Design a protein around this ligand. Sequence first.
Ligand code: NAD
Ligand code: NAD
Ligand code: NAD
Ligand code: NAD
Ligand code: BPY
Ligand code: BPY
Ligand code: BPY
Ligand code: BPY
Lengths: 233, 233, 233, 233
Amino acid sequence: NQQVVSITGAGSGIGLELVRSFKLAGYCVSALVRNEEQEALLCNEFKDALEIVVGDVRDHATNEKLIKQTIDRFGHLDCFIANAGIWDYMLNIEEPWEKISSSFDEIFDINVKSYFSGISAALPELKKTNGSVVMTASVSSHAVGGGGSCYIASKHAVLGMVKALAYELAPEIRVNAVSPGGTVTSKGLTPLGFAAKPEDVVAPYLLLASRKQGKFITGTVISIDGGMALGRK
Amino acid sequence: NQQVVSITGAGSGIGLELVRSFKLAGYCVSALVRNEEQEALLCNEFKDALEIVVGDVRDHATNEKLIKQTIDRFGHLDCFIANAGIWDYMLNIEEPWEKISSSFDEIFDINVKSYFSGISAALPELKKTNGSVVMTASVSSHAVGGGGSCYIASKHAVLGMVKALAYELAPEIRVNAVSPGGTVTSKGLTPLGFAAKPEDVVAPYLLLASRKQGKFITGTVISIDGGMALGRK
Amino acid sequence: NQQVVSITGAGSGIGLELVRSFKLAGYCVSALVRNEEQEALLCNEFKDALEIVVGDVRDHATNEKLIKQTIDRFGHLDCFIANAGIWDYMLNIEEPWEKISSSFDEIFDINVKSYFSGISAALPELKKTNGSVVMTASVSSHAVGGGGSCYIASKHAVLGMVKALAYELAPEIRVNAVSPGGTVTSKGLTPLGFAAKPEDVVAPYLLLASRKQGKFITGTVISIDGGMALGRK
Amino acid sequence: NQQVVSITGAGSGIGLELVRSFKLAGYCVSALVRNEEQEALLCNEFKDALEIVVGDVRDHATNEKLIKQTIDRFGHLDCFIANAGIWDYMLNIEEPWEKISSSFDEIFDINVKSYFSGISAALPELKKTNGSVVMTASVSSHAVGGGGSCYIASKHAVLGMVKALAYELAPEIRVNAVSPGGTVTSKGLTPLGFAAKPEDVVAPYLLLASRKQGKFITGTVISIDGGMALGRK
Ligand SMILES: NC(=O)c1ccc[n+]([C@@H]2O[C@H](COP(=O)([O-])OP(=O)(O)OC[C@H]3O[C@@H](n4cnc5c(N)ncnc54)[C@H](O)[C@@H]3O)[C@@H](O)[C@H]2O)c1
Ligand SMILES: NC(=O)c1ccc[n+]([C@@H]2O[C@H](COP(=O)([O-])OP(=O)(O)OC[C@H]3O[C@@H](n4cnc5c(N)ncnc54)[C@H](O)[C@@H]3O)[C@@H](O)[C@H]2O)c1
Ligand SMILES: NC(=O)c1ccc[n+]([C@@H]2O[C@H](COP(=O)([O-])OP(=O)(O)OC[C@H]3O[C@@H](n4cnc5c(N)ncnc54)[C@H](O)[C@@H]3O)[C@@H](O)[C@H]2O)c1
Ligand SMILES: NC(=O)c1ccc[n+]([C@@H]2O[C@H](COP(=O)([O-])OP(=O)(O)OC[C@H]3O[C@@H](n4cnc5c(N)ncnc54)[C@H](O)[C@@H]3O)[C@@H](O)[C@H]2O)c1
Ligand SMILES: Oc1cccc(-c2ccccc2)c1O
Ligand SMILES: Oc1cccc(-c2ccccc2)c1O
Ligand SMILES: Oc1cccc(-c2ccccc2)c1O
Ligand SMILES: Oc1cccc(-c2ccccc2)c1O
C-alpha cells in the first residue's frame, strides 16, 4: 500500500523538487542532504514529515545510515533515487594533469561510485518489495557540448550502470534513469528555446518510480532536455 | 484550458487504451478506426462523447477529415498521436522477392508514410496551439529479435522521424515517441518476466502529451518494453 | 582465392570511387550504373575489365541481371555493395502533402526498398561463398541536420536493415554499413573543418568487405563524416 | 613521412598484436608493458627495434616517460593507442560493498583514468603533428552481458571520452575507438559462431590511425565483436 522513496542530492535543485513532488504524490520520503544549511531548509519546510540525513554520499556508511533510518521510520523501501552529482565546469584536457586528476577523482566518486554505493546499500530492502532505482543521468550521457570530457564520461558511465543493473536485477528490481539538461539550479539555448526550472523536470521520475505507471519499464533513460540531445539549432 | 487529442489506430490495442486513458484524464478525443466493427465498439462504449472517423490511414483525405472533424467539434487540436501500425510476421529475407516487395509496401505505407501523412494534416492546427506529436515506435526501433527486417527497418525509420521532426519543428511543436514491446493486442519473454496488457503501457503517452509534465520534452523516445531492448535473459 | 564485388550507384561519387579502389585492391568488379552517359565513362576508363549493367535499381530484374551477369563472367559473388541513393534537398514537412508524398516514394524506393531488392537478388550467391553485404548509410542515420525528415528517416531505416539482416543471416553472411557525411559528389562545416573528396571515404568499405580484415565484423556501422555526428562546432 | 605510434597494454593480447601489425605496416613503435616478463618477450621478438617502457599505466610519470622516450628516439608522435585494460569477472552488485569498492577503483583507474592520463601526456606531441588517438573500448560499451556493472560502466565511460575529446580536439586531433568483443587473450557464443584471435581484430586500429585512410574519421567507434552487440542468437 504505502510507498516509500529515498532521495540523495535532496537539499537543492532537482533533488529538492523531487522531495516536494513525491511528498505531494503521497510517498513517505527520506532525504540525504550535504550539510547543515540544507538540513535547516527541509526541517523548516516539511517539519518532521521527512527522515533526513546529513553526510557525504561518497561515504558508504552515510548511505547505509540513510537506508537504515528509512526502514526504521517507515518500515520498508520501494524506490531509491540516486541523484547527487557535480559538474566539471568544462575542464579542458589540455590542463595540467594534476588538475585533471583531482577533478576526475571527485566527479567519478560522486557521479558514479556513489550511485553504486547507494544502490548497494538500498538493495537488500528493495529486494523485499520488488522496488526500483531511478538514477539521474544527463544530456551529457548522450551528447557532447554540455560539459568537459570528465563530466561526459561520468554520465556515459551512468548509462552503462542503468543498462547493466537493469539486466542483472531483473525481474525483481527495475532500474531506470532520467537525463535532464538545460535547467537552472545552483549557456543553455536548447531547441525549445528556454531553460527549465527544476519543477518542470520531475514528472519522469514519478513515472519511473510509480508501481502502476512504471511496472513495465526498466533499462530506460528518459531525456528531458528541451531537445538538446539533438544538437544546436 | 481544455485539451484535445487525436489518435489513430484507436479501434484496438494500445490505441483503444489511449482513448480511455486520455478521456479519463479530461481530454476531448477524436479517433480514427479502421472499419465499421471498431466504430461500433467505441460508439457503444463512449456514446457520442468522441469524434470518430472510419477509413484507411494510408489515405491523406481520411487524415485531413480526422483533423477537420476534430476542429469543428472541439475548436482546436493540442496533440496528434500517430499510432496505427502493422507487423511483418518475421518475414524472412530469403523469401520470393515479390512476396517481400508487397509486404514492404504495406509495412512502410502504414508504419511510416501514414505518420508523415497525419502529421502533415495535423500540422496547421498544432501550430496554432503550440501542440505536440507522439508517435508509436517499437522495441524494434532499438533492438533486433521482435520482427523481420522490414518491420525493424520501418520502426528505425520512425525514430528518424522523431529526431528529424523534433529538430525542424522546435520551438513551437514538440515531437516524441513511445517504444512499447512485448504486450498482447491482436514469443515474449522480456527480462521482467511478463507480457504487459495494453493498459499497462499508456502512461508515457500521457506524459509526452501533457503540457505541464511534458513542456520540456522533445526528440525523446521512451521505451516501455519490460527490458527487451537490453537482450534475452 | 579470387574475390568478386558487385556495386550499385557505381557511375559517380562514392560508387565510382569504390569501383576504382576495389579494382586496385585486386577484386573482379561488376557495376550497376543509371544511364548511358555513366556507362560510357566506365567503358572508357576500365575498357572491358568490368561487368556493367544499365538500369534502375528500383527494378528487381535489373538487380537480378546484375547478379546473373556477375556469376556468368566471374563465376561467383563475394560481396554486394548497395550504394545507390538520393537526397531530399531538405524538403520541409510544411509543404503540400502531394509534394511530400511523391518525394517520400522516391527516397524510400531508392534508399531502402532497392537495398532489400539487391540483397534479395545477391543472396543465393553470397550464401554459396559465405560472402558479405555492405550498405551505404549516412551521417543522417545517426544525427539530424544533413537532410529533411524523409531523408533522415530513410537512412535510419538502413541502420535498421543492417542490424536486422546481420542478425538473421549470421553466421554465414556478414552485413555492415558505412555512414559517410560531408563529402562533395553531384553547407558542410564538419568539426574536422573540411569536406572530403569521395576517394577519401572508401577505406571502410574495403575493410568491411575484406575476408581477412573483416571476418569478425557484422552488425557494424562505420561513420566517416569528419565528426559531424557529434554536432556543429 | 615516417609515422610513429605509441601503444599501452602492448605486452599481450590485442596490444601485442598491434605492435606486430603496426611494425609490419612500417610504423616506428613505442610500447608500454606491465612487467619484466612482458618486456623480455618483446626484446627477444623485436630486438632493439622498439622503444619499451615498463610501469603501471596508473602512474602519470610512466605515461610521460613513454612519450618522452618516443620523441627522443623517433623525434615525434603521430598516434597514441590507449589500450591497457582490465576485466571485472562479472562482479555482482549484491556483493559486499568493500569488495565492490576496491574493484571499482581498479577498473576505473585502469580503463578510464589511465586513458585520460596517457592522452594528457601524449597531447603536446600530437598537437605538433595533428596526430590521432585510438582508444580500446569494448562490446560492453554498447551492450550488456559481457561483464559486470563496473566493467560495463567503465566502457560506457570510454565512449563518452571518445565523443567528448573528438569534439574538443577537432580539428587538429582525431579521436576514435575500437570495440572488440569475444576474442581470447589471457562464454563467447557471438552470432558469427566463433571467438576471434587477437590478430583477427587489428585492422580497425590501422584504419583509424592511418593518415590517408582515416583522415576524415573522428568521434567514431568501430565494433569488431562477431555481432555480439546485436544480442544472443
Ligand atoms: N540541472 C541541469 O542542467 C543538469 C544537467 C545535466 C545533469 N544534471 C544532473 O542532476 C543531478 C542533480 O542536479 P541539480 O541540477 O539539482 O544540481 P545542484 O547544483 O542542485 O547540486 C546537486 C545536489 O547534489 C548535492 N551534492 C553534491 N555533492 C554531494 C556529496 N558529496 N554528498 C552529498 N550530496 C552532494 C548537492 O549539495 C546538491 O544538493 C546531478 O547528478 C546532475 O549531474 C543536471
Ligand atoms: N503491442 C506490442 O507488442 C508492440 C510492439 C512493438 C510496436 N507496437 C506498435 O504499437 C502500435 C499500435 O499497436 P497495437 O499493439 O495496439 O496493435 P493492433 O493489433 O491493435 O493493431 C494496430 C491498430 O492499428 C489499426 N490499423 C492497421 N492498419 C490500419 C490502416 N491501414 N488504417 C487505419 N488503421 C489501421 C488497426 O486496425 C489497429 O486498430 C503499432 O504501431 C505497433 O507497430 C506494438
Ligand atoms: N556524399 C555525402 O555527403 C553523403 C552523405 C550521406 C549519405 N550519402 C549516401 O552515399 C551513397 C552514394 O552517394 P554519392 O555521394 O556517391 O551521391 P551521387 O550524387 O553520386 O549519386 C548516387 C549514385 O546513385 C545513382 N542512382 C540514383 N538513383 C538511381 C537509380 N534509381 N537507379 C540506379 N542508380 C541510381 C546515381 O546515378 C549515382 O550514381 C547514397 O546512398 C547517399 O545517400 C552520401
Ligand atoms: N579480448 C576481448 O574479448 C575484449 C573484449 C572487450 C574489451 N577488451 C579490451 O581490450 C583491451 C586490451 O585487452 P586484451 O584482450 O588484449 O586483454 P589482456 O588480458 O591481454 O590484458 C590487457 C593488457 O593490458 C595490461 N595491463 C593491465 N593493467 C595494467 C596496468 N595497470 N599498467 C600497465 N598495463 C596493464 C596487461 O598487462 C595486458 O598487457 C582492454 O582495454 C579490454 O578492456 C577486450
Ligand atoms: O550540469 C550541472 C549539474 C550540477 C550543477 C550545475 C551548476 C551548478 C551551479 C551553477 C551552474 C551550474 C550544473 O550546470
Ligand atoms: O508488434 C505487433 C504490432 C501489431 C500487432 C501485433 C500482433 C497482432 C496480432 C497477433 C499478434 C501480434 C504485433 O505483434
Ligand atoms: O547527401 C547526398 C547524397 C547524394 C547526392 C547529394 C548531392 C547531389 C548533388 C548536389 C549536392 C548534393 C547529397 O548531398
Ligand atoms: O574482456 C577481457 C579483457 C581483458 C582480459 C580478459 C580476460 C583475461 C583472462 C582470461 C579471460 C578473460 C577479458 O575477458
